[PDB]
Amino acid sequence: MKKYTCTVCGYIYNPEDGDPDNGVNPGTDFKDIPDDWVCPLCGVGKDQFEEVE
């Protein structure tokens, strides 16, 4: 699974770690994160994230 980066602040979503404190379990692909989730550091929405190739 690919990492995604917040293009506003630089936070990296790593699917191996998830974001469990906000209900995103380890192993969750970015696309499957509920679409009301926001960056845990700066608070912007999923639409400001981009796939890390």
Q: Residues within the annotated binding site?
A: 6, 9, 39, 42
Annotated binding-site residues for Fe cation read 6, 9, 39, 42
CA distance to 15, 20, 29, per residue, from 7 (Å):
17, 21, 18
Six token digits for residue 7? 């293009």
Nearest to 44 by CA among 10, 1, 15: 10
